[PDB]
Amino acid sequence: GNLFDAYLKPYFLEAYRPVRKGDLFLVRGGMRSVEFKVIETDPAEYCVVAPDTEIFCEGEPVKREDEERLDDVGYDDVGGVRKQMAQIRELVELPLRHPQLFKSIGVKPPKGILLYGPPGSGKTLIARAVANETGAFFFCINGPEIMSKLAGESESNLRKAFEEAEKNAPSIIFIDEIDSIAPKREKTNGEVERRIVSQLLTLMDGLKSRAHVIVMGATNRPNSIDPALRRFGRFDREIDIGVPDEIGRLEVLRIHTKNMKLAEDVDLERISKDTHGYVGADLAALCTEAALQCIREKMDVIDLEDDSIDAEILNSMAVTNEHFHTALGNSNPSALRETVVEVPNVSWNDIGGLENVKRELQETVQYPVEHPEKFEKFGMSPSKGVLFYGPPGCGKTLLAKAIANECQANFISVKGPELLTMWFGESEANVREIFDKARQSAPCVLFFDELDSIATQRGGGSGGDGGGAADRVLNQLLTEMDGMNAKKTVFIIGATNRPDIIDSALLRPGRLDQLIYIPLPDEDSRLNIFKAALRKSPIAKDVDIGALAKYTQGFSGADITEICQRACKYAIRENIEKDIEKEKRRSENPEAMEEDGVDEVSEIKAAHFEESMKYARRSVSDADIRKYQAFAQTLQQSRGFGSE
Amino acid sequence: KSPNRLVVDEAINDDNSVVSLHPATMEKLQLFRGDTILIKGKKRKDTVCIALADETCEEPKIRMNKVVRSNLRVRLGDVISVHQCPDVKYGKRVHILPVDDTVEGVTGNLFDAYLKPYFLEAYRPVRKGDLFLVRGGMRSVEFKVIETDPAEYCVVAPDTEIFCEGEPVKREDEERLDDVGYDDVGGVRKQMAQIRELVELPLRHPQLFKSIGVKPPKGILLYGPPGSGKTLIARAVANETGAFFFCINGPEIMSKLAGESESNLRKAFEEAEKNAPSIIFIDEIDSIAPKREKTNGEVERRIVSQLLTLMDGLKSRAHVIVMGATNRPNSIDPALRRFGRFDREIDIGVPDEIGRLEVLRIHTKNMKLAEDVDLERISKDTHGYVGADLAALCTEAALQCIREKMDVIDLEDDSIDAEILNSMAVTNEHFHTALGNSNPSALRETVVEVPNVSWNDIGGLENVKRELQETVQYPVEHPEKFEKFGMSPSKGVLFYGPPGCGKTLLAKAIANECQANFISVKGPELLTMWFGESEANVREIFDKARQSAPCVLFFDELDSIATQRGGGSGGDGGGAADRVLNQLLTEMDGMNAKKTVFIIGATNRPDIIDSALLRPGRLDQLIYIPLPDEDSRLNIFKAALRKSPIAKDVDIGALAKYTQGFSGADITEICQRACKYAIRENIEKDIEKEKRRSENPEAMEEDGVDEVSEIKAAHFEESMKYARRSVSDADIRKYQAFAQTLQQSRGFGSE
Ligand SMILES: Nc1ncnc2c1ncn2[C@@H]1O[C@H](COP(=O)(O)OP(=O)(O)NP(=O)(O)O)[C@@H](O)[C@H]1O
């Protein structure tokens, strides 16, 4: 159709753009990217396009003539991975682009790369992007393709792949689904599988005498791979392509929506915030669903017999926020149960009070991390083990997240139920994975919430004599924390609402020995908590938050948040009833004057707070408060005689 | 672009002459309702049909049944042209003959058997060369209009002559009007809608999709209990889209010698890529691609890998869609549930009551049901019956009718009289016997349905109703207001109180009020999953609530699984309880993101409930349901006695009076025992009447209508005499004490 006004006119109308004969430029729109080659320019091969300049696009399509696809996967088509992609670039680009320098130096760079991560997180995409950006001869070995071909042909295919890679040096050998090729020996129950595994190992070993050949495997998790592949010469570098954080999801959405014209009010930030647990594949699928919904809506406009759709129609198909909302509702996460490494959004302002705890945490965590040189100079190393104890709802988790955000360090959240539910503790390796992750993501803050269910004292505090899961997990944690002292930039924090039953082994130096007591908020702390909870909410001026903070002794932050939630529920009920009454009044007299005095500004009135307080109640008895105060000087005294 | 060009779609009414159009479009075209119009489709075929108004349809679409579409040689998604033709004339004579294939066997006076009922009542349009379907005698007969007068288009009238003395006519490349379609599948409207939206758009319009550049999904996996469809749905979709349908069967592939299985898969995919648009239905895909942990062979792995390679290669496809089918997704290898491979999963589950009614109507439309055959009763009495069971019970009823009527007709006749077949009416007794002789197949499967319980079924608990409306209904139906106000609500509730108070009826009632799905889960059901060893099943349940959003996932009998670790747990070595509790905690932590899933609990032992479930995000909204007061007891008595005959002398207010500390269950048992006493009295009176008749059979027959049995006050007195309390006052005071102490368990406590 009229490609000119559809693509070129928006592309040149605003900015004065340089142009050179023979160059191809890419224009995105209509759910597709179009490459335009400059056939001719005036007055010379180099020109600048201006509004008065004439543009001629009445000719026939031009051939590619050995040009590369500008839509090929590149570093700009991969989002949510900047650190991992940087590592991959530093490993790959330098030798492949400059093999002569490396062979002249004499130093041997690594050749074994293993991208492990949840399905849909990239891996295949990253390898194609690296291959296209380096131009290296890319050979894509596919696990199932090898495993389908008859016996003897699989080994032949592997041998041919490696030999051809050694001929087209510099080269890359991407082994997708390497778990099928090389599963654990404990799982494989066949001879041909072992033969293929051994052939792969032999070829990787022979790649020591290589020609600038890099092997780039890919698997869902490293455990499913045979251990022999994770050794020297073989796949020795391992890169975790994990679930992207919020900004990564935003980048993925921008990547998958750049060819589409988004309508106004389509807030990709909202979708990214609402897409927790979504790997890049899910975010590409929801965008596709939204586009298909838009196409279905606009199909009635255009007859369905036309072979080609009008370019103007495609460029005018604007995807509305409703389409994305429906697609998100119809879609579900794929990596929801995967451990997530991210910098939490919680800051100091989100927590009210606990100023001394903030001071101690800054002195204990922030200074070792951001200022390790001073600690080394002073002559001794700090302790990397903290243990929050206190009444429930006091804000332990918000403090761990807050300190992680302040230090700009990673945060891994682990709960006792999550540890135990790992096949009732039988899949012990998973635990050893978590700490390993903290070793990769250093600096890190590995938080262990709900320690009252796993760290139960052996016998005295443990609810199940035959429940070996708790003791097994506790012993694994103790061993790993013993092994984690060497890592300078890993801090392990705990949290238990049952300090009496916490196993004293965790209180040993090196382990979680820095006991920190978080008390029930005082009057000022309660005022601060009310302010924090009511933040980002409309509140009436007649509400004296100071009065609410007054009295209300022994109220945890959770109770205060529930108070606000119930007050908001009452306000919502009142607004709904008022809207219903307005609708009834309109129905009785639809011709009545429309009193359009702007939408009512709903605010939490003092009556709603009074009702919420009336139906509100305490969650910590004074007996518990005094017992916690007593354990403020007795919890540490459990490693020796005690625990009864 | 014209106002008379419309996209065909599925119809509501199954008649072969009614065509429903949106009233806006009819007014645009100036069409009189109930008048004749002419429709032209593909090739050069056209039909004459009577139009009607239907606001449900959209302006750019017209709804027709499979008969009219077949006459027009148009599938769904095609476009047809409509022209007003009120000048149609009544026909003096019509020569109509049946088809050989459809009429094979049955012979006789087909005219009065099929055509006369079909034309006697309504004036029906007819067009030469068109085939119409008549259902009866446990079969459908296709009649082709050989000739019409005065023109090819006519309207049949009572005075019109009908000639059906000719021989059977050949099919002549016509399609079987009995082929499976969307009208032959019932109990699946949402799932079928998803399948249509995924499949019909690309297959019918592949050129548009390849021009747009967007890639639609190709991997579809229908998972559900056996007998729920799957195979039927794929055939229906293939027949409705006309796409080249290749049916790969798991066992057929696995039987052929080694090397031939891979060859067959390769040939299937290659041929599908040649007949594009196409579909590749892989039935019993669990046998082809079972879990690696289960397969113990090399050829199996080779076939799995070949299938994976072919699915991956289908990225460079020719409008090819793969439509697998399995009983459950767990038995399938995980590799198949990834991107490019089977990424869309549709649950063809057990139909609800209306779905069972639709299935029964589908399987009884070819049969003439006698009066008093209430299909609603059967559907209500067929819980746990998948479509196969409902098709088998109808078949059993038909066979019972045939056996009963066999004595009338000699058994040597090759063909049965058509009148006899049309006069074989299936009685409710046949269906009752068939239902008694049949058993459910999906009884143990989790059921997602909207419960029938409403607020009226529960008496009292007005404040609980208020809280539940403020806590559940408003977030669901009004989420925008919650988002605007600046914070999100809690999705965790916990009913606690004496047994028999009505927790389950409240969860079902709120689910019905919100018109949201309801999943009922009991602690015994969780534990009995191989004593908690089959942990994945638990993760399935929550996943189901994620598919059926909005949902109300109820956990009854939490006193058996949520027992406090050690203090409240009866078994130290019973790791099942702790394992299930930890799984629930993890899943509820993972469920907070899903806005439209509400998790409700219920425990009659709040003291031993694990405090972990009381954490915010988890079941933190504690709700106490007390023993009914006097007014509540009166309301419960009214609810229980509802839909029952009760004598006027019974003062239900007096029954509600006193009777302190009586749960609703005790009140229901009171009514049940009173009804038992009334039944005994009626039986004794009938026996005495029979004895009196036997003594004097010639006595006057005092036919004063059947006695109107009512629960007399004496029956209630006896029931109360034998009735007793189920909650001691000590329990009542302990519950009141825990009304302010249950929440105080997460910190110090639990002893
Ligand atoms: N991080 C990402 N950034 C951008 N697009 C992505 C990202 N991850 C996935 N996608 C998109 O989603 C598609 C499917 O994911 P892909 O990365 O190809 O699967 P995979 O990770 O190779 N699967 P498996 O090998 O089974 O674990 C990609 O081809 C991209 O289109």
Ligand SMILES: Nc1ncnc2c1ncn2[C@@H]1O[C@H](COP(=O)(O)OP(=O)(O)NP(=O)(O)O)[C@@H](O)[C@H]1O
């Ligand atoms: N200091 C605080 N300021 C503001 N809100 C707070 C504070 N402390 C607690 N809250 C609120 O209460 C919630 C629960 O606090 P959290 O940090 O999860 O306590 P916990 O003791 O780790 N929980 P649990 O293990 O369930 O007893 C927070 O997410 C806030 O909503």
Ligand SMILES: Nc1ncnc2c1ncn2[C@@H]1O[C@H](COP(=O)(O)OP(=O)(O)NP(=O)(O)O)[C@@H](O)[C@H]1O
């Ligand atoms: N939802 C349904 N609506 C109408 N008829 C149905 C339905 N489900 C099953 N039937 C009927 O019952 C028959 C048998 O069920 P069918 O759906 O063919 O088995 P299946 O689900 O393919 N079995 P499996 O593949 O072993 O799980 C169908 O061919 C129909 O005649």
Ligand SMILES: Nc1ncnc2c1ncn2[C@@H]1O[C@H](COP(=O)(O)OP(=O)(O)NP(=O)(O)O)[C@@H](O)[C@H]1O
């Ligand atoms: N408010 C009520 N109104 C009417 N009938 C009621 C009411 N409460 C209880 N019932 C009757 O009692 C039955 C049992 O109530 P249900 O809701 O199952 O209580 P529960 O506490 O969940 N049961 P359990 O766990 O066995 O103690 C209902 O099915 C009704 O027959």
Ligand SMILES: [Mg+2]
């Ligand atoms: Mg891949």
Ligand SMILES: [Mg+2]
């Ligand atoms: Mg905690």
Ligand SMILES: [Mg+2]
């Ligand atoms: Mg089948």
Ligand SMILES: [Mg+2]
């Ligand atoms: Mg219950």
